[PDB]
């Protein structure tokens, strides 16, 4: 940076604080990743300066040709990477992408049917403090108590009992892979749309590592952020029939201006994930996940599900009596970043849990391989079997720094 | 910039086309500006990278030390800037600013009382085809139709007749001062909230240069981006009563994760209003937009309410039978960038109108001056006196040239 520091030597002093932050710690938060300086720049460009409500040709203000041309390279983009047949790309973040689909299909009051959020389902899938919880009438399916895999007979018996408009399926902490043919099949026999919500998953569904949800679904959300590795904000994906309803939802449904700096920078994260090496890096994400899950087990850890199918894993961690919040908060004293989460039929509240959650999208941006993982395994061991032990908590430290570097 | 000309020929190509489309031409479209280049660094920062839903010292995720440091500069700049107790800094826009304070205090079918949208009123102030008119029952005030000043007697007998549970003050397109405290007397007399949207002369208000809503109204919504030239974002200031469901209103009630990054720029740009120089610039403002306004008269154009207090003004281009749809075509031509703009009682449709919508803050950022708007509004003047001439047209985009240097 050139300016910032100069003008303000506070904020400045914080950034370098959090990017060596950054730097330091084992990042194992499932959401998080690490977005190139191609795409930085694009976000800290000029295009902030421009009001362009409305669509590319179709605008409300003059002079959006040029950003006119940024907003169809992502939406194209988008496209080739997931085969949709229209694209919006002005959600401001996850939370709006599903707020204007659930906008343009819902009344208010309508039954929803989405995945119970003790077992992986997200915040914007109907809790009673959300607008989504508040606004619309939302039931749950679950996944089986010893499996921890969705129950499809639940789903179904779910959506024949309640008679949802809408379905929603995908999660925020589920790892094992989405039968999106299963949900289109009950969605068809109750007359309901289907909603797939991949936020966690699209970079591995954009590099053929996890089923595609767009063939079966009629609305796909996503976040552009996480192991997509693009700037933080929404995308709605949707077949032709759905276009100028989910645009109008958008804009002037929902939002106002876009943010035509940070779709610049969704161009560019698309950009990258159409090549090649994006699609070498998202296996070596499933890989070192299921190499994570394989590590933890031979360390005595219980896997959620016996293991993972994807990017991200939870353990149980009732048989080492620990709470989540005590494991995160232990993990945060020698370097390593994980959350507190809610384990199928966890018996705690969702504010201590029996859980915690990992995923290995960032520490494999950051070059992480099969290796690094055994270790990462081998020192959540020593740290969970010897809470009360500052050597070990040192030890641990020590060797997690001698992974960063 | 280094990485993204490498990167993305095509996205880099289409940003520096922006870049220089900004400087080429006169942007006098009201709601824009120019942030400054430490503003945009800090969007263009790490941040991106980092999840912290929840607030400073109260996250959901570990790690949040460094952008609890941001967060917390960008609300105290904030209370420093406004005299507010309360400042949230997460909301994505304007317009999520604005739902999260009606999800605060309105029930599904509530009544709201807001300005007219054909007199100044914002969309997400209750049109049918925005999320404000279809979830909550807008009524409207108007302004008087000779003065075109709101007509604050409309404003208390809408209020008494209707017995709204919420009052909305402030505009896109008002060229005069706002009365907040005949507002929140209304208010009072109804027990009704008042909201003040105080998008468009933030930074007037900052600059002291306009009444402060914070005293009379429980709510304040804003745009970080428009006159107070922060970064493209919201904020919702409210007293200390109201924090508390405000903060939650946002998370988790409407948004997921805020934008760090912009949350940093948001932190940039309330240093820099803070700054004796910026003073000095709004009222160059909001001078400019008087002597544009003056200079406009002196071409025989007629102004909604003769004249503006502010930074904007509203060209009635009936008396040259010229509709806003043709005015904005015509002066794109020539290099300068106006909205078309219904005016009070105009009798087009919202999509022709029979007015230009001027605002001085983008120039004004450019050091444009007294003698600059003198010769912006000869310009203005050759180009609607002659629009069949492509001599005329001819001489305005050289003169336009010229001022742009
Ligand atoms: C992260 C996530 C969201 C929310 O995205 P924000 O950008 O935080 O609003 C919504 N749904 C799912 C499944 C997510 O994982
Ligand atoms: C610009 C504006 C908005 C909307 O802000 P976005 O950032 O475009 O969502 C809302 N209210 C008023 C008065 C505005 O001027």
Redesign the interface.
Known sequence: ????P???P??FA??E???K??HA?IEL?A?????????????????????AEGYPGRR????C???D??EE?ARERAKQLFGAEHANVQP?????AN?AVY?TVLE?GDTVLGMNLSHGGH??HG?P???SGV?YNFVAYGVDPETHVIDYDDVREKARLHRPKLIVAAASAYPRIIDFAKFREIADEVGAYLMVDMAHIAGLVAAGLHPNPVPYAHFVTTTT?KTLRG??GGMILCQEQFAKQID?AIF??????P?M?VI?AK??AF??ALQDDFKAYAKRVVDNAKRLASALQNEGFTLVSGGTDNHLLLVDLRPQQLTGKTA?KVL?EVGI???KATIPYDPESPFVTSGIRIGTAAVTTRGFGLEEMDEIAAIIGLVLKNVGSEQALEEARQRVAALTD
Chains 1, 2 share one sequence.
């Open positions: 940076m050139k300016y910032l100069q003008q303000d506070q904020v914080a950034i604080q959090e990017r932050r950054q710690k938060i959401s998080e990743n690490f977005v190139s300086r191609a795409v930085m720049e694009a976000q800290g460009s000029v295009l902030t300066n421009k009001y409300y203000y003059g002079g040709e040029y950003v041309i940024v390279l401001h973040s996850g939370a709006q707020m906008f208010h915040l914007t809790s403090v959300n607008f606004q952020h700037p933080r109008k002037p449904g929902i939002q106002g201006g943010l700096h610049a161009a560019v950009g990258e995160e945060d970043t994980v959350n």
